[PDB]
Symmetry: D2
Subunit: 419 residues, 4 copies
């Protein structure tokens, strides 16, 4: 396994260019399964998740190719199954379900198992599909779906807010008979992006971005060219990178409107933030960040994807911070790792109390999940001495060349195919 | 002191006309503090809470009078405070805050104390105001706010979804200099209703009903005529009345689109439902309800105000149901009371596991919650023998003559005064 | 209703004599139901709760008289039921259950309803009796028990650590045919106190105070005289009164060994402590307390009955404090009351995060818990100006003359007759 | 990286011998560090952890060798540190801390990070040692302890019931100056076990098994011969194995009173059990298990180590069943895996509602926990079809030849390897 070897303390400063959103590219790649014509998705970051998606798409009899773009030829889809291998590697493989059943009348996907950060059930996906008129059964650990002819429009109310289930139900409804109404739908920028992608293809959708999505079924989906939005989570991680290192920074290729809460939290931290129409600028004035209070919740509130990062920010901040996590059950893995580094913290249920310390100490830590890994990398950057982050493979699923981007910021980092 | 005597088991069936929403009439009644001209609010239910707002209003130097409607004249407001006594009996009293300091540059409201259901801080209200330029301080239990001149519109991202704080900020913003953007705003129907009422007065509002409300501060508010929307909770309660009694019912004067989550849940419990534009039809077909799973959350998800009612539904349903509460948490007072009647249930944190039973037994129970404890009267209706619900002043707070409506559905119930 | 008018701030200094424990007196009074001959219980505090138990005993046909002692003659008990009204005034009434069935083969108690601090089910009580051979049915809110012949000893492993259930099962077992083992029994000092009492009556018990209590049933219990232990919560509460007021105090007629957790906690808050066989001295050296961390759990861990008091301590302590409640998840009524007084806290589920402030301010607050009540009176002592605590009926239930005790310490406190 | 291959449905029945308990051998093996004369530890199971423990022992400069028993020679203990690699592969490595600082005046151990089942902080181990006078610092991920001369005994009250912290403080105190008192100590059979081992070495200990452990510091410890006690968890796992299958079983070298809670639950599940001073016999009578309720708490209540095992039982049992976990935050990993097998389960916070299903289908699943692992395997042992369990290394951590044992019990299990 690769590892990162980092040395600090180090002031993170400079310019950085945001990559396409991991969370927009994924659901759009799966949506392409609905397209009968050549498709061109632009601004797709290079990630292990995209690789696994191209690999899975190919397995489905799809024609895939990439650079900054990813060329998709879904005209010939031949197989209808996502093997245990793929789902195991990438949860998002569940996304092939809706499109497959909507276009082909059948589809199978290995029932995901527990996750690093939570049980992560797909109950809502299956449920939405059933509402759409698909027959679903569990066999050999396989979620078996099928429908006779076309899916049927329906008024579906979501139990809880789910990004993934909204993508799943939204996607399949595009090809169904009638009108679909997804109530209590996720408002995530990536939901909007995926809906727009679907509309580019000839779908009838409205309300994307609000708690209510209306879809009018159409005979088929063509093809086109779509540019995935900027990654709000990568952007956030960089703003933070600067905010905890007394540095300054400018984010090129960003979409400020997707991160209001994060920006508000940064300001509450004592950050000097300014925004353009495609750029964000943060300045710490050499100052130490102030502790803030954080409560994760669905968009546009504070995203759970920024959580590990904010904890880090609280850990080297002046004051006592409190972080409450409402989306994921086991999303504190980063904490004990940071303590190993000299941070003071206490966990109580779904909340962690942060007692800011002046400086961090280099140590050997373990990446457990993607966004915590990026938190550990950032911790290494500011901590004293050497920090080695084991299992940086997590980082590589959701981050495109993070070592390089950090390096350009003045980071002392080496990817090590060691020990 | 007021008590309900109920005899069952009794099949609930017939017709019912839904009154005006308590939760829409309250905030509109306080927003009236902004109008410099005679205002008439139509379709106001006759509730103890409405009497209290009237009382609070009068003491502000306000001209108030009611019947079907409530006549308001706030051109002469001289007193700027909500006393301890009123805030005690009536929590919504805090709503006087925003309008007062927006309109007169000042306001005082007693800080609400302990609440059985979950404790309920108003941090969000205060914070919101402060974001608008108001200076706030705590004195002798009173939240004191003031502003030199006019409030300044701001970009406010809510830490959490708050019906109350949203109304406070939305209301006050109508009179500020500039634009106010409320991100992560509550989507409640009563919010659309209050925004609409504010516009009827001369306010510039948009986004009401979505997570992003925009307010263009205007110079002053006039007066007008506005009809309060139907009561969604009262509707669901009656719907549940039929669903738990093998009954059949028709709701007249309803606004179906405000209760999709409740309609969907009911369907899941085996109910045959149909809707028109101002009516809702429910039929159990003599059927005992099917256990279901509930998760309260912000609108349009499952409403915490329907919670105790659904716990009842679960308690006498086939199978094991689960009620999880994310808004109030300690909102399970009805449970032990129902266990007094034969129900089988365990409370684990913010969740109640429901073990459905065939029959309930009449017994003496205690009302405590203004919406929860209508559940005890519903339970009385279908329970074996005689049930006495003490302290019915609770139901009188949120339910307009519930015994008259129940009686017309075929219930054996009598309001025994004093004892 | 009665009330407390308190004026501060006031440093709490002096001596106090600890009363007999409310919590040992109660179960011992109920156990006296098993005695065939006159019984004398010494050191019984004068409390509303003792009044109520006396009333209940009398209704059963018990002969009861009191001063410092309580005189009992249960030789001619003729009635076997605890009525709705009694149980509603004081839940300990459920304690009549076990002794009635074991001795008379029959017993009826009104099923306790919802509680302020938590649902407080009595499933373990009922279950344990059933394990001993009692037949039990729920009729009109009454837990009707009966045992064809004589109770039978059984091996009982408790699902949860329960003071109430351990007392009920233990009392009943004394008259059971055979042997009874209570595995995972509560270790509360009061459990030990009640067990010695039973022994003094001729019962065969051992293990009291440890995880497994063994009871060798006997044909009959006679009479005797028993001296109740000192009230640990009263003791802890006075300790807190000095630890939060930079004062000094000595407790007379105390039992240090029953409060090690509280003592250790106090030390951490920076208190100078000394103890002897029957006394405890607390010296804050004029110092403000250091925020501490608290986790309620079964004895000998930190007692949930000291919880609200430590919350108060954290509230005026230096630093950020954390209070976690594992016995009663809703035991936070006092927090918002304290917030009304200038305190700074956030409630996250079963945990309250305390941010110590320099001073508190007088305000009108409402008592609710026969323990937060005390906390509010303490806060009044150290707060700036005038504090009024409504509903002090609560205090009277758990504290014997708390105003004279405080008064003797320097407290400016007056009992107002309603206004 | 091997993986079990399983096939069913198979009826588990017959006779199995119980190995030494993993939980006693470990801390006992660590207490060895104190023994000046060769010690012979008996009944030690062949476990990955036992090997890793020996490896760790060796590194400190200790003679270690084994078979059925382990030989230790702490005579020439030269080295003072636990290496990152060891602490990483085995958390229990923190155990070497008390012995090192007690016996050698110094001791360093790599700070454990996050755990599979939860954060698992060692705050109590550290805080305790400090009560003993040890100076402790964190440097480079290393917990650094040292003491000027000898550890002074002190009165210590445990914030929480920690088995590990109870072993560490008890162990270190055996060589302390004066008497040590551990209040609110863990009561686990493994503490009784370890305490006995320590006394056997010439140390003064009492209270072991109760909530109060008293230690009188002695001048030094020597050798001896000690036999570890029977593995309660293994016994429970086997008893369950035989209960979920409808079979019969008999455990050898069992010690029944270490598991009263598990036994009673099995009876609630309708299983015919009998005990003898040495052995345990479970007979399902070909009957299917009955859904039960479970709450994990410290010994003697239901152990968390039997949690996953009981979820399985509930999963394939008649009716719904509830399981609540109070010891570990993230201990439901096995659930999603189980669902992959066709089980109906809902997770709510720290509670899992188990909907008993008639049958389980073979499927590929992932072992994650050294306790759930056994759960998946058992699941296969009764599932219709073929089941492959990945990363079965977990089993090897606390399971001596479990495939062998299961096979003797009539199971279709094969340890596939390679790939
Ligand atoms: C590839 C991708 O887009 N990943 C993002 C997506 O994941 P993901 O799509 O999994 O997010 P969801 O919003 O669906 O999950 C949120 C909550 O809903 C629960 N749930 C979800 C679906 C279901 O059928 N049943 C159910 O119980 C979850 O287990 C969790 O407790 O949204 C998360 C929340 O912003 C982000 O943190 C992830 O980075
Ligand atoms: C008069 C009225 O219309 N009452 C309704 C309104 O009350 P209310 O306005 O009080 O509802 P909120 O939406 O504000 O409260 C929701 C959640 O937010 C928390 N919170 C709220 C405000 C704040 O400043 N800080 C904070 O932490 C609460 O304590 C709770 O945990 O919405 C509730 C939820 O839909 C309904 O059940 C009430 O019947
Ligand atoms: C009159 C008296 O002596 N009162 C004390 C006693 O009350 P009480 O006897 O009610 O205390 P319990 O120990 O039984 O209750 C503790 C926990 O067990 C639960 N539980 C209890 C019984 C049962 O059958 N089922 C069940 O689930 C409770 O609801 C709670 O979650 O112990 C409490 C905890 O030390 C103290 O705060 C009370 O002041
Ligand atoms: C090798 C061994 O003997 N393992 C057992 C031991 O582990 P372990 O020794 O780790 O068990 P603990 O009793 O210490 O842990 C119990 C609870 O206390 C907490 N805690 C503990 C120590 C501390 O310093 N701080 C703290 O917060 C824990 O993180 C957990 O929430 O007991 C557990 C509980 O029966 C078993 O499931 C483990 O199989």
């Amino acid at each position: 396994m690769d590892k990162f070897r980092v040395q600090g303390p180090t002031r993170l400063q400079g310019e950085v260019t945001i990559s396409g959103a991991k969370n927009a590219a994924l659901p759009i790649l799966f949506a392409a399964l609905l397209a009968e014509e050549p498709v061109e998705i632009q601004n797709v970051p290079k990630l292990k998740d995209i690789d696994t998606t191209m690999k899975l798409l190919t397995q489905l009899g799809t024609k895939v190719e990439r650079x900054g773009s990813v060329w998709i030829d879904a005209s010939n889809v031949n197989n209808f199954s996502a093997p245990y291998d793929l789902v195991k590697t990438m949860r998002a493989s569940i996304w092939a379900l809706g499109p497959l059943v909507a276009r082909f009348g059948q589809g199978q996907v290995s029932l995901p198992g527990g996750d690093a950060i939570g049980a992560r059930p797909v109950d809502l996906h299956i449920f939405g599909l059933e509402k759409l008129g698909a027959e679903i059964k569990l066999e050999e650990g396989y979620v078996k779906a099928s429908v006779n002819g076309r899916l049927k429009g329906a008024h579906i109310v979501m139990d809880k807010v789910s990004v993934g289930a909204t993508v799943t139900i939204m996607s399949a409804a595009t090809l169904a008979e009638g009108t679909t109404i997804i109530e209590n739908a996720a408002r995530e920028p990536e939901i909007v992006d995926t809906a727009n992608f679907l509309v580019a293809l000839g779908a009838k959708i409205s309300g994307q971005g609000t708690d209510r999505i209306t879809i009018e079924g159409v005979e088929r989906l063509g093809g086109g060219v779509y540019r995935v939005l900027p990654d709000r989570i990568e952007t956030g991680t960089f703003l933070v990178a600067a905010a905890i290192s007394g540095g300054k920074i400018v984010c090129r290729n960003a979409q400020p409107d997707t991160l209001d809460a994060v920006l508000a939290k940064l300001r509450e931290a004592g950050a000097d933030i300014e925004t353009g129409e495609d750029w964000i600028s943060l300045d710490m004035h050499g100052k130490r960040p102030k502790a803030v209070t954080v409560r994760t919740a669905p968009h546009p509130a504070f995203p759970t994807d920024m959580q590990a990062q904010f904890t880090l920010l609280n850990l080297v901040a002046e004051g006592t911070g409190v972080i409450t996590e409402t989306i994921f059950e086991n999303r504190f893995m980063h904490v004990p790792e940071l303590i190993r580094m000299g941070a003071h913290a206490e966990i109580e249920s779904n909340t962690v109390i942060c007692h800011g310390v002046e400086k961090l100490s280099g140590a050997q830590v373990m990446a457990t999940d993607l966004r915590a890994s990026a938190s550990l990398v950032l911790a290494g950057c500011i901590a004293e001495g050497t920090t080695v982050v084991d299992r940086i493979y997590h980082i590589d699923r959701g981050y495109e060349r993070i070592e390089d981007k950090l390096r350009a910021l003045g980071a002392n980092i080496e990817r090590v195919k060691g020990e």
